[PDB]
From a paper:
The crystal structure of Rv0045c was determined by SAD and was refined to 2.8 Å resolution. The model clearly contains two distinct structural domains: an almost globular α/β fold domain (α1β1β2β3α2α3β4α4β5α5β6α6α9β9α10β10α11α12) and an inserted cap domain (α7α8β7β8) which interacts with the α/β fold domain. The α/β fold domain of Rv0045c consists of a mostly parallel, 8-stranded β sheet surrounded by α-helices on both sides (only the second strand is antiparallel), which has been regarded as the “canonical” feature of the α/β hydrolase fold family. Sequence alignments revealed that the “nucleophile elbow” of G-X-S-X-G sequence motif is located in the sharp turn connecting β5 and α5 and is highly conversed among these enzymes, although Rv0045c shows no significant sequence homology to any other α/β hydrolase fold family member. The active site formed by Ser154 and His309 is shielded by the cap domain. The cap domain and the α/β fold domain within Rv0045c provide a wide and open cavity for larger substrates.
Sequence comparisons show that Rv0045c shares a low sequence identity (<30%) to other members of the α/β hydrolase fold family, however, the consensus sequence G-X-S-X-G of the nucleophile elbow and the catalytic residues are highly conserved.
Residue numbers in the entry: 38 to 193, 205 to 329
């Protein structure tokens, strides 16, 4: 299997995963350097989606299809089709600084932001440095403290075959449907000329200053709602109460059963329902 394959070849699998029938939504990869994004059915968008570390904007495909709504899914810097830095800084503070121009242009009227991990926190930042852009906010299995805990704990390249990247991520999660895993890896890697394959994402040398972030939370007037992986230990009861404590309008936690950290990968049907309810109807 050789892959001169369009990045949207597998949309139908996404539609099936979402349990939605009917015609697929309009889509194009869009850019304002230094950023790439996929704009959806638009003539839009009502919602912005920010992915997590190691991921790219394709993790939201099934969620976005499942959801009726026009939207902007962004490749954070260091990720997918967005520029790397090699100062290694894809901190939420940096990420927001550069996205803010881009979201003014593309998706000027987006009511909502949905961020998982790295994207959730950069969305926090974006909400503080640009309240006009962030009407309401949705965090996917992340708290400023919860990611710092992760950063601390994990403070510590060319592949002969696509299959070898596949096996590697099979090892990460053997219990998962290969067809899905293959999809995610497809959108997350590319072939060189050598024949050899490589990850589209950069390795992260730096997360941000997590305390200014909390001052941003204190400062945020946008309502936050949190979504947790029922089987994810990433975010704790303590982390949650704290979020509630510091937050101006905390709308609560939805805890999704049988989902890990990446809720959009694990139980997108449920994430769809949660997000749907957040659009006030």
């Amino acid at each position: 299997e050789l892959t001169g394959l369009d990045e949207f070849a597998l949309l139908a699998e996404n539609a099936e995963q979402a349990g939605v029938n009917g015609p697929l939504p309009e889509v194009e990869r869009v850019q304002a350097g230094a950023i790439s994004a996929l704009r959806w059915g638009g003539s839009a968008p009502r919602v912005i989606f920010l992915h997590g570390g190691g991921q790219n904007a394709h993790t939201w495909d099934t969620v976005i299809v499942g959801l009726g709504e026009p939207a902007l899914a962004v490749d954070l810097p260091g990720h997918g089709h967005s520029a790397w830095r090699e100062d290694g800084n894809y901190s939420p503070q940096l990420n927001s600084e550069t996205l803010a121009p881009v979201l003014r242009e593309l998706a000027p009227g987006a009511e909502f932001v949905v961020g998982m991990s790295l994207g959730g926190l950069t969305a926090i930042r974006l909400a503080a440095m640009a309240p006009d852009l962030v009407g309401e906010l949705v965090l996917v299995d992340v708290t400023p403290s919860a990611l710092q805990r992760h950063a601390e704990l994990t403070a510590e390249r060319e592949f002969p075959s696509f299959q070898a990247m596949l096996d590697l991520t099979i090892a990460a999660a053997p219990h998962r449907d290969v067809k899905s895993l293959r999809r995610g890896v497809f959108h997350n890697s590319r072939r060189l000329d050598n024949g050899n394959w490589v990850w589209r994402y950069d390795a992260i040398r730096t997360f941000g200053d997590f305390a200014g972030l909390w001052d941003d939370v204190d400062a945020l007037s946008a309502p936050i709602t949190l979504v947790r992986g029922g089987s994810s230990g990433f975010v704790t009861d303590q982390d949650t109460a704290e979020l509630h404590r510091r937050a101006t309008h905390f709308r609560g936690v939805h805890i999704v059963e049988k989902s890990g950290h990446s809720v959009q990968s694990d139980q997108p049907r449920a994430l769809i329902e949660i997000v749907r309810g957040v659009l006030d109807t």
